[PDB]
């Protein structure tokens, strides 16, 4: 039909085949459900209208179905559009040295070529702006992008080229505040600079919670949405593709296991009650700071196999502290209902519980297929990627909430360098912790033995009041 005859032939251009039930399906601007990578590229650079939601979602999630080098190749191929031949009358005009009318040729340039080409430059611009890490990770990808952008011709295009170049140069330069005064840094037994004595009971619990909240706030803010798409952090190139997400997970493992280690390696019962009570006070200060992540790390250490079973320890923990722990536990019950309302009801700044996003992303990744099948043809399941992208969007809404708290560089380093496992792998460390729990508090038929004190300093806490 007339509309399809004015588009380029399939023998000269791959992005103009007619839409069909076996190359694209959909759920204002229509919402793409699934499609071939070629039909996804066509709609990413659609001539009829701009589509900021699809562009944003595509560039966050495309790595789960297309490599960066392949995407750049596809948008460059999209950009090189063949022009139609002159009409018979215009061929005669050209043959006589005269100017052709070129009525359809001019219509095709203005209504299809120029919009698609600007749509391609818009993808390039959004790509360099929001996902510059693709270019930092692949210097050759950036070389290709700059060669492409640098050889575009025309005045309306050179302005787009300049704004794309401006972002690229700003991103390269980038790689090579508090309204109120922050509260005074709290000290307890350990003195500033005496890093050799830093420990759970020697540092002030207020300061432990404040420095862990700064650390976790920074780890939470550094996570980029694409590190969470397609379970790439659990796959071969995880270190390159999910460096910030892996640091976030490693910190929670290390901190959680260090709390467990602090507890079960305190073999004396009265000393272990002081350790458990101190971790609960740390949790209370995380609650005051709206560090839900920290609260649920403490809940996770208290609920772990080696700690949860310590009946004699928890028996000496005051009811008030047991009630705080129970209420913190109940943040997680009923698919995190209390937590979700508390996250929305509190005033910023805060650190959301990161684990819930990973759980929801993994359920979406496992619960939906990679492709949809329509008339024997496989189509990329794009709605699956959009659902994952919507969860990463929830992560991003809390990533601009800095804390009015002073960094204590030695305490920061102390928590950044937690290494409870040492040369052990996680399984043999958790097996060791559990066996240590059986040693300090044997199962009921066996009696409770006594163990000598390991701490020379006082056990009384300075409390959670500044």
Ligand X SMILES: COc1cc2ncnc(N[C@H](C)c3ccccc3)c2cc1OC
Contacts with ligand X, residue ranges (CB under 6 A):
299, 302-303, 308, 314, 322, 325-326, 328-329
Q: Do 392 and 60 touch, CB atoms closer than 8 A? A: yes
Q: How far is the CB of 283 from ligand X (least distance, A)?
A: 9
**Tokens 């640098």 label which residue?**
150
Angle at 33 between CA 27 and CA 39, to 5 degrees: 125
Kindly tell me which of 53 and 305 has the beta carbon lying closer to ligand X: 305
In whole angstroms, how close is the CB of 425 to ligand X at the nearest point?
Answer: 24
User: Nearest approach, Cβ of 248 to ligand X (angstroms)?
Assistant: 22
Q: Please give the helix or strand (H or E) that residue 26 lies within, else none.
A: strand 24-26
Q: Name the residue nearer to ligand X (CB basis): 237 or 311.
A: 311
286 closest CA partner among 409, 403, 201, 420: 403
E strand or H helix at 159: helix 155-175
* Residue 325 Cβ vs ligand X, minimum distance, rounded to whole Å: 4
Q: Which is nearer to ligand X, 141 or 302 (CB)?
A: 302
Q: Which C-beta is closer to ligand X: that of 136 or that of 326?
A: 326
CA distance 242 to 233: 5
* Residue 460 Cβ vs ligand X, minimum distance, rounded to whole Å: 22
Cis before 174 (ω within 30):
no
Q: Which has the closest alpha carbon to 214: 278, 294, 277? A: 294
Least distance from C-beta 205 to ligand X, angstroms? Answer: 17
Residues in contact with 305: Cβ distance below 8 Å, sequence separation at least 6, in sequence order: 430, 433, 434, 437
- Shortest distance (Å) from residue 308 CB to ligand X: 5
Least Å distance, CB 162 to ligand X, is 57
Tokens of 104: 């359809």
How far apart (Å, rounded) are the C-alpha atoms in residues 337 and 351? 17
State which residue, 116 or 310, has the beta carbon closest to ligand X: 310
Nearest to ligand X of 47, 309 (CB atom): 309
- Report the residue number, 159 or 322, with the smaller CB distance to ligand X: 322
Q: Determine how β-strand 371-374 pairs with β-strand 377-381.
A: antiparallel
CB contact at 8 A, 195 and 414: yes
What is the number of other CB atoms lying within 10 angstroms of the CB of residue 394? Answer: 13
d(CA 271, CA 452): 9
Of 120 and 282, nearer to ligand X (C-beta) is: 282
Q: Which residues of 182-207 are buried (b: 16+ CB within 10 A; e: fewer)?
A: eeebbbbebeeeeeeebebbebbbbb
Residue nearest to ligand X (CB): 329
Q: Least distance in Å: CB of 184 to ligand X?
A: 31
Shortest distance in whole angstroms from residue 328 CB to ligand X = 6
Q: Angle at Cα 360 formed by Cα 374 and Cα 254, nearest 5°?
A: 135
Residue closer to ligand X by CB (options 314, 414) is 314
Q: Are the CB atoms for 382 and 33 separated by under 8 Å?
A: yes
Helix residue ranges, H only, 200-237 = 205-222
Of 238 and 329, which has the nearer Cβ to ligand X? 329
């Amino acid at each position: 039909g007339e509309e399809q005859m004015r588009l380029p032939s399939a023998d000269v251009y791959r992005f103009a085949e007619p839409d069909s039930e076996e190359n694209i399906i959909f759920e204002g601007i229509p919402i793409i459900k699934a499609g071939t990578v070629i039909k996804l590229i066509e709609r990413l650079t659609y001539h009829m209208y701009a589509d900021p939601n699809f562009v944003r979602t595509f560039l966050t999630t495309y790595r789960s179905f297309c490599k960066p080098q392949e995407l750049l190749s596809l948008i460059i191929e999209r950009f090189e559009i063949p022009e139609p031949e002159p009409t018979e009358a215009d061929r005669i005009a050209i043959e006589n040295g005269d100017q052709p009318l070129s009525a359809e040729l001019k219509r095709f340039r203005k209504e299809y070529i120029q919009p698609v080409q600007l749509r391609v430059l818009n993808v390039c611009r959004h790509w360099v702006e929001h996902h510059f890490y693709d270019f930092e990770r692949d210097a050759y990808l950036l070389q290709r992008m700059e060669e492409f952008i640098g050889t575009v011709r025309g005045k309306a295009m050179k302005k787009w080229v300049e704004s794309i170049t401006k972002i690229i140069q700003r991103k390269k330069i980038a790689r090579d505040t508090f309204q109120s005064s922050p509260p005074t840094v709290e000290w307890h037994i350990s003195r500033p600079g005496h890093i050799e004595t830093f420990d759970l009971l020697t540092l002030h619990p207020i300061e432990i919670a404040r420095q862990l909240t700064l650390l976790e706030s920074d780890l939470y803010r550094a996570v980029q949405p694409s590190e969470l798409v397609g379970s790439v952090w659990t796959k071969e190139d995880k270190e390159i593709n999910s460096p910030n997400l892996l640091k976030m997970i490693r910190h929670t493992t290390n901190l959680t296991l260090w709390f467990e280690k602090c507890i079960v390696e305190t073999e004396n019962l009265e000393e272990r009650v002081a350790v458990v009570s101190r971790i609960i006070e740390i949790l209370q200060v995380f609650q005051e700071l709206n560090n839900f992540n920290g609260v649920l790390e403490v809940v996770s250490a208290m609920n772990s196999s080696p700690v949860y079973r310590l009946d004699h320890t928890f028996e000496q923990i005051p009811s008030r502290q047991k009630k705080i722990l129970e209420e913190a536990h109940e943040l997680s019950e009923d698919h995190y209902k209390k937590y979700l309302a508390k996250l929305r009801s509190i005033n910023p700044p805060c650190v959301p519980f990161f684990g819930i996003y990973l759980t929801n992303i993994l359920k979406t990744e496992e619960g939906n297929p990679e492709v949809l099948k329509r008339h024997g043809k496989e189509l990329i399941n794009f709605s699956k990627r959009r659902k994952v992208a919507e969860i990463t969007g929830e992560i991003q809404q809390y990533q601009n909430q800095p804390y009015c708290l002073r960094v204590e560089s030695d305490i920061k380093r102390f928590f950044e360098n937690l290494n409870p496992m040492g040369n052990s792998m996680e399984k043999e460390f958790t097996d060791y912790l559990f066996n240590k729990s059986l040693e300090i508090e044997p199962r009921n038929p066996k009696p409770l033995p006594r163990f000598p004190k390991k701490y020379s300093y006082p056990l009384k806490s300075p409390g959670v009041r500044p």
